[PDB]
Protein backbone atom coordinates (compact mmCIF):
# COMPACT_ATOMS: atom_id res chain seq x y z
CA UNK A 1 0.00 0.00 0.00
CA UNK A 2 1.89 3.01 -1.33
CA UNK A 3 0.54 6.55 -0.97
CA UNK A 4 -0.54 8.77 -3.81
CA UNK A 5 -0.78 12.45 -2.91
CA UNK A 6 -3.60 13.89 -5.01
CA UNK A 7 -3.90 17.44 -3.72
CA UNK A 8 -1.90 19.09 -0.95
CA UNK A 9 -1.49 22.48 0.58
CA UNK A 10 0.74 21.44 3.45
CA UNK A 11 4.15 21.64 5.07
CA UNK A 12 6.16 18.95 3.27
CA UNK A 13 7.00 17.42 6.65
CA UNK A 14 3.43 17.70 7.91
CA UNK A 15 2.49 15.94 4.67
CA UNK A 16 4.67 13.05 5.85
CA UNK A 17 3.34 12.97 9.41
CA UNK A 18 -0.13 12.73 7.88
CA UNK A 19 0.88 9.95 5.50
CA UNK A 20 2.47 8.21 8.48
CA UNK A 21 -0.42 8.68 10.91
CA UNK A 22 -2.57 7.11 8.18
CA UNK A 23 -0.56 3.93 7.66
CA UNK A 24 -0.74 3.48 11.43
CA UNK A 25 -4.48 4.13 11.67
CA UNK A 26 -4.97 1.49 8.98
CA UNK A 27 -3.14 -1.09 11.07
CA UNK A 28 -5.11 -0.26 14.22
CA UNK A 29 -8.57 0.19 12.84
CA UNK A 30 -10.81 -1.39 10.20
CA UNK A 31 -13.89 0.84 10.27
CA UNK A 32 -13.45 4.14 8.43
CA UNK A 33 -14.92 6.27 11.23
CA UNK A 34 -12.24 4.99 13.60
CA UNK A 35 -9.42 5.49 11.10
CA UNK A 36 -10.42 9.11 10.50
CA UNK A 37 -10.94 9.51 14.25
CA UNK A 38 -7.40 8.32 14.95
CA UNK A 39 -5.83 10.78 12.53
CA UNK A 40 -7.96 13.75 13.58
CA UNK A 41 -7.17 13.19 17.26
CA UNK A 42 -3.49 12.86 16.34
CA UNK A 43 -3.20 16.17 14.53
CA UNK A 44 -5.16 18.14 17.12
CA UNK A 45 -2.49 16.69 19.40
CA UNK A 46 0.64 17.30 17.33
CA UNK A 47 -0.71 20.44 15.68
CA UNK A 48 -3.54 22.41 17.21
CA UNK A 49 -7.32 22.42 16.71
CA UNK A 50 -9.21 22.09 14.70
CA UNK A 51 -8.64 19.26 12.22
CA UNK A 52 -11.32 17.25 10.44
CA UNK A 53 -10.68 13.88 8.80
CA UNK A 54 -12.63 11.96 6.18
CA UNK A 55 -11.87 8.41 5.05
CA UNK A 56 -13.48 6.12 2.52
CA UNK A 57 -13.44 4.93 -1.07
CA UNK A 58 -16.54 6.63 -2.45
CA UNK A 59 -17.07 10.32 -1.74
CA UNK A 60 -16.46 13.88 -2.85
CA UNK A 61 -16.39 17.08 -0.90
CA UNK A 62 -16.43 20.87 -0.83
CA UNK A 63 -14.53 22.29 2.11
CA UNK A 64 -12.64 25.32 3.39
CA UNK A 65 -9.23 25.06 5.04
CA UNK A 66 -6.52 27.18 6.65
CA UNK A 67 -3.64 28.03 4.30
CA UNK A 68 -0.97 25.33 4.36
CA UNK A 69 -3.12 22.88 6.30
CA UNK A 70 -4.87 20.72 3.70
CA UNK A 71 -4.01 17.31 2.26
CA UNK A 72 -5.81 14.67 0.20
CA UNK A 73 -4.25 11.35 -0.75
CA UNK A 74 -4.84 7.66 -1.42
CA UNK A 75 -3.37 4.88 0.70
CA UNK A 76 -3.66 2.32 -1.96
CA UNK A 77 -7.35 1.66 -2.35
CA UNK A 78 -8.55 4.05 0.32
CA UNK A 79 -8.92 7.82 0.21
CA UNK A 80 -7.89 10.16 3.03
CA UNK A 81 -8.86 13.83 3.25
CA UNK A 82 -7.45 15.90 6.11
CA UNK A 83 -7.59 19.63 6.82
CA UNK A 84 -7.72 22.17 9.62
CA UNK A 85 -10.48 24.75 9.72
CA UNK A 86 -9.52 25.89 13.04
CA UNK B 1 -35.75 9.21 -2.64
CA UNK B 2 -36.84 9.95 0.93
CA UNK B 3 -34.43 11.37 3.51
CA UNK B 4 -33.25 9.58 6.60
CA UNK B 5 -31.74 11.85 9.24
CA UNK B 6 -29.04 9.83 10.99
CA UNK B 7 -27.45 12.36 13.32
CA UNK B 8 -28.31 16.04 13.70
CA UNK B 9 -27.38 18.92 15.90
CA UNK B 10 -29.25 21.59 14.00
CA UNK B 11 -32.09 24.09 13.99
CA UNK B 12 -35.11 22.02 12.96
CA UNK B 13 -35.76 24.49 10.14
CA UNK B 14 -32.10 24.59 9.10
CA UNK B 15 -32.35 20.80 9.04
CA UNK B 16 -35.06 21.23 6.40
CA UNK B 17 -33.19 23.80 4.32
CA UNK B 18 -30.30 21.34 4.25
CA UNK B 19 -32.53 18.43 3.25
CA UNK B 20 -34.01 20.70 0.58
CA UNK B 21 -30.72 22.08 -0.74
CA UNK B 22 -29.69 18.44 -1.11
CA UNK B 23 -32.63 17.24 -3.20
CA UNK B 24 -31.92 20.20 -5.48
CA UNK B 25 -28.18 19.53 -5.72
CA UNK B 26 -29.02 15.96 -6.72
CA UNK B 27 -31.13 17.19 -9.62
CA UNK B 28 -28.47 19.62 -10.83
CA UNK B 29 -25.35 17.58 -10.39
CA UNK B 30 -24.21 13.97 -10.83
CA UNK B 31 -20.64 14.05 -9.53
CA UNK B 32 -20.38 14.04 -5.74
CA UNK B 33 -17.85 16.88 -5.58
CA UNK B 34 -20.31 19.17 -7.36
CA UNK B 35 -23.25 18.12 -5.18
CA UNK B 36 -21.32 18.86 -1.99
CA UNK B 37 -20.03 22.06 -3.60
CA UNK B 38 -23.57 23.23 -4.32
CA UNK B 39 -24.73 22.71 -0.75
CA UNK B 40 -21.64 24.23 0.86
CA UNK B 41 -21.88 27.36 -1.28
CA UNK B 42 -25.58 27.55 -0.44
CA UNK B 43 -25.17 27.53 3.32
CA UNK B 44 -22.27 29.98 3.35
CA UNK B 45 -24.79 32.11 1.48
CA UNK B 46 -27.91 31.56 3.59
CA UNK B 47 -25.99 31.11 6.83
CA UNK B 48 -22.46 32.38 7.23
CA UNK B 49 -19.02 30.81 6.80
CA UNK B 50 -17.72 28.38 7.18
CA UNK B 51 -19.56 25.23 6.10
CA UNK B 52 -18.00 22.03 4.79
CA UNK B 53 -19.92 19.39 2.85
CA UNK B 54 -19.16 15.74 2.17
CA UNK B 55 -21.17 13.49 -0.15
CA UNK B 56 -20.82 9.86 -1.13
CA UNK B 57 -21.87 6.31 -0.36
CA UNK B 58 -18.71 4.92 1.20
CA UNK B 59 -16.95 6.95 3.89
CA UNK B 60 -16.64 7.73 7.57
CA UNK B 61 -15.36 10.78 9.34
CA UNK B 62 -14.16 12.46 12.52
CA UNK B 63 -14.97 16.14 12.61
CA UNK B 64 -15.58 19.12 14.90
CA UNK B 65 -18.54 21.45 14.48
CA UNK B 66 -20.14 24.55 15.98
CA UNK B 67 -22.99 23.80 18.38
CA UNK B 68 -26.31 23.51 16.55
CA UNK B 69 -24.69 23.45 13.11
CA UNK B 70 -24.19 19.78 12.25
CA UNK B 71 -26.30 17.35 10.22
CA UNK B 72 -25.80 13.91 8.67
CA UNK B 73 -28.44 12.15 6.60
CA UNK B 74 -29.14 9.82 3.69
CA UNK B 75 -30.97 10.87 0.55
CA UNK B 76 -31.97 7.42 -0.36
CA UNK B 77 -28.80 5.69 -1.40
CA UNK B 78 -26.46 8.61 -0.91
CA UNK B 79 -24.98 10.03 2.29
CA UNK B 80 -24.72 13.74 3.06
CA UNK B 81 -22.65 15.21 5.89
CA UNK B 82 -22.81 18.96 6.49
CA UNK B 83 -21.41 21.12 9.28
CA UNK B 84 -20.00 24.56 10.03
CA UNK B 85 -16.62 24.91 11.67
CA UNK B 86 -16.57 28.51 11.17
CA UNK C 1 -8.07 -37.75 -22.43
CA UNK C 2 -6.18 -34.74 -23.76
CA UNK C 3 -7.53 -31.20 -23.39
CA UNK C 4 -8.61 -28.98 -26.24
CA UNK C 5 -8.85 -25.30 -25.34
CA UNK C 6 -11.68 -23.86 -27.44
CA UNK C 7 -11.97 -20.31 -26.15
CA UNK C 8 -9.97 -18.66 -23.37
CA UNK C 9 -9.56 -15.27 -21.84
CA UNK C 10 -7.34 -16.31 -18.98
CA UNK C 11 -3.92 -16.11 -17.36
CA UNK C 12 -1.91 -18.80 -19.16
CA UNK C 13 -1.07 -20.33 -15.78
CA UNK C 14 -4.65 -20.05 -14.51
CA UNK C 15 -5.58 -21.81 -17.75
CA UNK C 16 -3.40 -24.70 -16.57
CA UNK C 17 -4.73 -24.78 -13.02
CA UNK C 18 -8.21 -25.02 -14.54
CA UNK C 19 -7.19 -27.80 -16.93
CA UNK C 20 -5.60 -29.54 -13.94
CA UNK C 21 -8.49 -29.07 -11.52
CA UNK C 22 -10.64 -30.64 -14.24
CA UNK C 23 -8.63 -33.82 -14.76
CA UNK C 24 -8.81 -34.27 -10.99
CA UNK C 25 -12.55 -33.62 -10.76
CA UNK C 26 -13.04 -36.26 -13.45
CA UNK C 27 -11.22 -38.84 -11.36
CA UNK C 28 -13.18 -38.01 -8.21
CA UNK C 29 -16.64 -37.56 -9.59
CA UNK C 30 -18.89 -39.14 -12.22
CA UNK C 31 -21.96 -36.91 -12.16
CA UNK C 32 -21.53 -33.61 -13.99
CA UNK C 33 -22.99 -31.48 -11.20
CA UNK C 34 -20.31 -32.76 -8.82
CA UNK C 35 -17.49 -32.26 -11.32
CA UNK C 36 -18.49 -28.64 -11.92
CA UNK C 37 -19.01 -28.24 -8.18
CA UNK C 38 -15.47 -29.43 -7.47
CA UNK C 39 -13.90 -26.97 -9.89
CA UNK C 40 -16.04 -24.00 -8.84
CA UNK C 41 -15.24 -24.56 -5.16
CA UNK C 42 -11.57 -24.89 -6.09
CA UNK C 43 -11.28 -21.58 -7.90
CA UNK C 44 -13.23 -19.61 -5.31
CA UNK C 45 -10.57 -21.06 -3.03
CA UNK C 46 -7.43 -20.45 -5.10
CA UNK C 47 -8.78 -17.31 -6.74
CA UNK C 48 -11.62 -15.34 -5.22
CA UNK C 49 -15.39 -15.33 -5.71
CA UNK C 50 -17.28 -15.66 -7.73
CA UNK C 51 -16.71 -18.49 -10.21
CA UNK C 52 -19.39 -20.50 -11.99
CA UNK C 53 -18.76 -23.87 -13.63
CA UNK C 54 -20.71 -25.79 -16.25
CA UNK C 55 -19.94 -29.34 -17.37
CA UNK C 56 -21.55 -31.63 -19.91
CA UNK C 57 -21.52 -32.82 -23.50
CA UNK C 58 -24.61 -31.13 -24.88
CA UNK C 59 -25.14 -27.43 -24.16
CA UNK C 60 -24.54 -23.87 -25.27
CA UNK C 61 -24.47 -20.67 -23.32
CA UNK C 62 -24.50 -16.88 -23.25
CA UNK C 63 -22.61 -15.46 -20.32
CA UNK C 64 -20.71 -12.43 -19.03
CA UNK C 65 -17.30 -12.69 -17.38
CA UNK C 66 -14.59 -10.57 -15.78
CA UNK C 67 -11.72 -9.72 -18.12
CA UNK C 68 -9.04 -12.42 -18.07
CA UNK C 69 -11.19 -14.87 -16.12
CA UNK C 70 -12.94 -17.03 -18.72
CA UNK C 71 -12.08 -20.44 -20.16
CA UNK C 72 -13.88 -23.08 -22.23
CA UNK C 73 -12.33 -26.40 -23.18
CA UNK C 74 -12.91 -30.09 -23.84
CA UNK C 75 -11.45 -32.87 -21.73
CA UNK C 76 -11.74 -35.43 -24.39
CA UNK C 77 -15.42 -36.09 -24.77
CA UNK C 78 -16.62 -33.70 -22.10
CA UNK C 79 -16.99 -29.93 -22.22
CA UNK C 80 -15.96 -27.59 -19.40
CA UNK C 81 -16.94 -23.92 -19.17
CA UNK C 82 -15.52 -21.85 -16.32
CA UNK C 83 -15.66 -18.12 -15.61
CA UNK C 84 -15.79 -15.58 -12.80
CA UNK C 85 -18.55 -13.00 -12.70
CA UNK C 86 -17.59 -11.86 -9.39
Amino acid sequence: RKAVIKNADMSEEMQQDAVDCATQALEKYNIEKDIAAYIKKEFDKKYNPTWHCIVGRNFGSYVTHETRHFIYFYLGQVAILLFKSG
Amino acid sequence: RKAVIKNADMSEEMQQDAVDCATQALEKYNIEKDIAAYIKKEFDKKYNPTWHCIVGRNFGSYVTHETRHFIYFYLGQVAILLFKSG
Amino acid sequence: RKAVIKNADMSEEMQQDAVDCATQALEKYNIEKDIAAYIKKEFDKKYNPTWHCIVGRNFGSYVTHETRHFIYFYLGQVAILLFKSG
Binding site: D9, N58, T67 | - | -
Partner: peptide, 17 residues
Protein backbone atom coordinates in the same frame (compact mmCIF):
# COMPACT_ATOMS: atom_id res chain seq x y z
CA UNK D 1 -5.51 33.31 4.30
CA UNK D 2 -7.93 30.47 3.58
CA UNK D 3 -8.74 28.40 0.50
CA UNK D 4 -11.64 26.20 -0.63
CA UNK D 5 -11.10 22.87 -2.34
CA UNK D 6 -12.99 20.03 -4.00
CA UNK D 7 -12.13 16.35 -3.59
CA UNK D 8 -13.84 13.68 -5.68
CA UNK D 9 -12.67 10.06 -5.70
CA UNK D 10 -11.94 7.87 -8.72
CA UNK D 11 -13.88 4.78 -7.60
CA UNK D 12 -11.64 2.36 -9.42
CA UNK D 13 -13.53 1.85 -12.67
CA UNK D 14 -15.17 -1.56 -13.01
CA UNK D 15 -12.91 -4.12 -14.68
CA UNK D 16 -13.84 -4.51 -18.34
CA UNK D 17 -16.23 -7.38 -19.03
Amino acid sequence: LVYTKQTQTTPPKETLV
